[PDB]
Design a protein around this nucleic acid. Structure first.
Ligand SMILES: [Zn+2]
Lengths: 216, 218, 116, 325, 82
RNA sequence: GACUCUGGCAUGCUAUUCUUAGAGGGACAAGUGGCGUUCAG
């Protein structure tokens, strides 16, 4: 946000952030992430400032939009909570998704079936996805990372302070990132709400799949 | 026939990238030897610094492989240093040549006294360190020549440095650390910041960013 | 003579196992849905793929030689009501203080819960 | 008399007690116990299988997510609940049951959640464990239809909605005393006591809260008014860089991060059983330890071993010559 | 760099770091040249211009690349104050 | 030569039906009848 009244955080976004629990960070704290916290509460939980989260999300969306080829953005998730969302993010944008195992040597070993050369890297979790951070360090790739309070900031350029442990928070962050990228490009109107609701981006958890197929 | 794998190799194969310095401008990794083969070509000469035969240990036994230390160099321009251990000596030599082609770095050249003509010497006194081996390069007046041990003389002659005073420290008997320390000193010649390079850098568009429309089709 | 290439074989097996539903019997419809589906370099490879898949859909629909559609049906599930749209949401007093400092103090869905 | 899998695990032969025995296939076929499948082919066959209706499983889920138990429930659990719902609706009149249940009432105490109350062998100031009582200690033991559920969530939802359920004891139960885990960041309650990360926000923040549900349908839960429970002492510490590979162990910050597979060998995880009929023929009184395997050299340990070591705060001082794994 | 006659006697001029003013090396493969988009001030849609920041590999190693990019974004008006 | 590239026809786009040279189409055994382990051919 360049102090633009269009790009400010609205009431519905704040309600979504409170509903998922993005303000509820981790319990540990990395010293480089202390700039993005609000206060330490009594029982130990670190509160994530939502305005800084909005500003870093806008910075990340601006970085993604500035990549001309939409396939040059690589979006990787290793753990389950981000997986579907990453695939859904591809359906929003066209960026190249890696869900599941990230094979080492993807960005460095040129003679491979899964060798690919991106231009911008977007990472669900810097703690879980350390290997693509190392490869991006080797092959000159800037990094977007959805960082929590206890998240190392080695080889990341834009750290988005948010809760990334819960499935709802991860899905919400990916959905608002996709919505902001599509609004920034201009393919969807900023005034009307997006027709894709954020519940499309959440983890399925097959026992809950059984419970939901039961109630049909 | 060369069939490139990387996007950089695809651009080098076509006429999108005209010079090697552009690839050195954005510090992109050169992962193919054919890029250096295409840009420099016949101007690259090779000089095998050393062949050491060594006995590889295996449960089958002590079997011999040869280790090649090769310094490749484009005169008044570039050097590369390659180390390769292999079964046959020719295979080790060509592997070291390939690994030295992948490590081609530019060297900055300056003047000792007043700036007349082409640069001939190292711009400022620099240092390269490798395993207790210290190599120090000092600017020299024109016409002096390289005053060094034979291996750094080889490297500085292939760098196009016409003249340079040298001082070494440590166990210089081992050739690998000595050559790598000289190579590191050559890299820090250009990595050094001087009052000449004080202008704010205007950012030219990246080669992947400029020719992304051509790279959509491939 | 003429023989089919192995890359065409594996790509057509992928197309058959992935999206057999939208594929049909006409050559040009199969070709256009094939160029719609996958990442595709060349025209001649596309046409070889289309011809081979058309011939093998002439084959397999006479006789043999479901999980992925159910998987993608589970993948694009959309609820009638968003789970984020809750009537009353719990809020911390410190989180409420942060919201007041960030100027969103006029919310209606928040309920402040004290640590008992 | 709807039999849940908890009665089958406990060898509850209450087939003579009831007559309307109704069970699900997926509450009996998933059991990996050999003795249960052995006695299943021996037990008299008067139990019968019945399927619930989609409307009734829909309604059961509809008020179960208003009770706040829906993440704790399972699919076959909902099958059992709605089967009992359909049976009591089709036999007995439906006016007995009430929907949209009562609110919670909060009454905290000074007692710790780790106070050892309601343990049979434990006694403060007489409570003895007699062989006349070893058959008696099951739970808080207090006409035609009922349930044989052992999970607290099933009892909770069935008693909030209003069905009289029972236990391995023949008499119907009256009160439900248990513990739940509550997040103190998001205030979401889970009936699964085994888990350590909450389902909503995912932090390592679940804490124990005691719950008592009366036979009326009124629930009251006790918090602990103790500063030791909500204390941020051993929580912030410097973390190592994340290591990869086959051997790296991570500090376990999320519930579903991919750990490398580091299992124990079969000889390393054999525990000696002493009441076997052929134990006395053993040359050694004990199962021999495993030192030969690669897992022994890597110091691979069980998940149970080293539990109080994790409870120490990392910002402390250990013994000089000891190393924490 | 430039001789007395006036010719630029140098192979190429290297880029410098946007935060710590250090020269990016030829094989500094952790170095980053990132483009951040500019938008119209009335609609918030992508304009076509972008601001470019270069970060050396050492700052990316130290974890200070995020703070440096944020500081440059506040300086260039991309990120609002507070 | 079961390797790589590629032509015939464009009244289509580009500075354009007669000359140009970049791109985009068009051809893939595609369809028909027989011989065929009824599938490879
Ligand atoms: Zn929680």
């Amino acid at each position: 946000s360049g102090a633009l009244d269009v790009l400010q955080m609205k009431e519905e976004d704040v309600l979504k952030f409170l509903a998922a629990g993005t303000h509820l960070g981790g319990t540990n704290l990395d010293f480089q992430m202390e700039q993005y916290i609000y206060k330490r509460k009594s029982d130990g939980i670190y509160i994530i400032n939502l305005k800084r989260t909005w500003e870093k999300l806008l910075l990340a969306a601006r970085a993604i939009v500035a990549i001309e080829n939409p396939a040059d953005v690589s979006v990787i998730s290793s753990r389950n909570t981000g997986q579907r969302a990453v695939l859904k993010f591809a359906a929003a944008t066209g960026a190249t998704p890696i869900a599941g195992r990230f094979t080492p040597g993807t960005f460095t070993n040129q003679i491979q079936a899964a060798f690919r050369e991106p231009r911008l890297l977007v990472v669900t979790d810097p703690r879980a996805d350390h290997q693509p951070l190392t490869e991006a360090s080797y092959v000159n790739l800037p990094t977007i990372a959805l960082c929590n309070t206890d998240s190392p900031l080695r080889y990341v350029d834009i750290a988005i302070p948010c809760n990334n442990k819960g499935a709802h928070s991860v899905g919400l962050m990916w959905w608002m990132l996709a919505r902001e990228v599509l609004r920034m490009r201009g393919t969807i109107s900023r005034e009307h709400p997006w027709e894709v609701m954020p519940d499309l981006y959440f983890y399925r958890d097959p026992e809950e799949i059984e419970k939901e197929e039961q109630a049909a | 026939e060369w069939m490139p794998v990387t996007k950089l190799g695809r651009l080098v194969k076509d006429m999108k990238i005209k010079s090697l310095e552009e690839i050195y401008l954005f510090s992109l990794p050169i992962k193919e030897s054919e890029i250096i083969d295409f840009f420099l070509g016949a101007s690259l000469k090779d000089e095998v610094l050393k062949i050491m035969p060594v006995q590889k240990q295996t449960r089958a036994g002590q079997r011999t492989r040869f280790k090649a230390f090769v310094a490749i160099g484009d005169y008044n321009g570039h050097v590369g240093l390659g180390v390769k251990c292999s079964k046959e000596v020719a295979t080790a030599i060509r592997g070291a040549i390939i690994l030295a082609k992948l490590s081609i770095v530019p060297v900055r050249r300056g003047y000792w006294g007043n700036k007349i003509g082409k640069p001939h010497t190292v711009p400022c006194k620099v240092t390269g360190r490798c395993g207790s081996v210290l190599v120090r390069l000092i600017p020299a007046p024109r016409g002096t020549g390289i005053v060094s041990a034979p291996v750094p003389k080889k490297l500085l002659m292939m760098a196009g440095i016409d003249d340079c005073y040298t001082s070494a420290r440590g166990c210089t008997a081992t050739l690998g650390n000595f050559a790598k320390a000289t190579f590191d000193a050559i890299s820090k010649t250009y990595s050094y910041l001087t009052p000449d390079l004080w202008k704010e850098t205007v950012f030219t568009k990246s080669p992947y960013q400029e020719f992304t429309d051509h790279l959509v089709k491939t | 003579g003429r023989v089919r290439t192995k890359t065409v074989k594996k790509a057509a097996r992928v197309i058959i196992e992935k999206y057999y539903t939208r594929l049909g019997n006409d050559f040009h419809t199969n070709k256009r849905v094939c160029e719609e589906i996958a990442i595709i370099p060349s025209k001649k490879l596309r046409n070889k793929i289309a011809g081979y898949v058309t011939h093998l859909m002439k084959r397999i629909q006479r006789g043999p030689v479901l999980q992925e559609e159910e998987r993608e049906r589970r993948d694009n599930y959309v609820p009638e009501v968003s789970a984020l749209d809750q009537e009353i949401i719990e809020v911390d007093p410190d989180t409420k203080e942060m919201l007041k400092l960030l100027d969103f103090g006029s919310l209606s869905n928040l309920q402040v819960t004290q640590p008992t | 008399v709807v039999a849940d899998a908890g009665a089958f695990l406990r060898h509850a032969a209450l087939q003579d007690i009831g007559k309307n025995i109704y069970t699900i296939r997926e509450v009996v076929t998933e059991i990996r116990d050999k003795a249960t499948r052995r006695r299943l082919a021996v037990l008299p066959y008067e139990l019968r299988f019945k399927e619930p209706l989609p409307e009734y499983v829909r309604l059961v889920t509809e008020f179960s997510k208003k009770t706040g138990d829906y993440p704790s429930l399972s699919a076959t659990d909902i099958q059992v609940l709605a089967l009992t719902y359909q049976l009591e609706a089709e036999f007995v009149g439906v006016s007995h049951l009430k929907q949209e249940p009562q609110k919670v009432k909060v009454s905290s105490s000074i007692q710790h959640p780790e106070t050892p109350l309601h343990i049979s062998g434990f006694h403060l100031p007489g409570g003895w464990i007699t062989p006349s009582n070893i058959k008696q200690i099951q739970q808080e033991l207090e006409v035609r239809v009922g349930c044989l559920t052992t999970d607290f969530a099933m009892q909770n939802v069935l008693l909030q909605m209003g069905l009289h359920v029972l236990a391995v004891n023949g008499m119907l139960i009256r009160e439900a005393r248990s513990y739940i885990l509550r997040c103190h960041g998001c205030f979401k309650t889970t009936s699964d006591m085994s888990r350590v990360f909450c389902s909503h926000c995912g932090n390592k923040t679940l804490k124990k809260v005691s719950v008592t549900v009366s036979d009326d349908g009124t629930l009251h839960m006790h918090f602990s008014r103790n500063p030791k429970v909500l204390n941020p002492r051993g929580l912030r510490y410097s973390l190592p860089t994340p290591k990869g590979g086959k051997y790296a162990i991570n500090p376990h910050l999320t519930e579903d991060q991919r750990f490398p597979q580091l299992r124990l060998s079969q000889k390393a995880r054999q525990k000696t059983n002493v009441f076997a009929p052929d134990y006395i023929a053993g040359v050694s009184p004990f199962v021999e330890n495993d030192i030969s395997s690669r897992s022994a050299t890597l110091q691979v340990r069980d998940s149970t071993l080293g539990a109080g070591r994790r409870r120490l705060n990392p910002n402390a001082s250990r013994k000089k010559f000891v190393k924490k794994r | 760099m430039q001789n007395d006659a006036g010719e630029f006697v140098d192979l190429y001029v290297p880029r410098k770091c946007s935060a710590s003013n250090r020269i990016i090396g030829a094989k500094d493969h952790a170095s980053i040249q990132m483009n951040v988009a500019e938008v119209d001030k009335v609609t918030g849609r992508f304009n076509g211009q972008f601001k470019t920041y270069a970060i050396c590999g050492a700052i990316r190693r130290m974890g200070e690349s995020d703070d440096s990019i944020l500081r440059l974004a506040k300086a260039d008006g991309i990120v609002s104050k507070n």
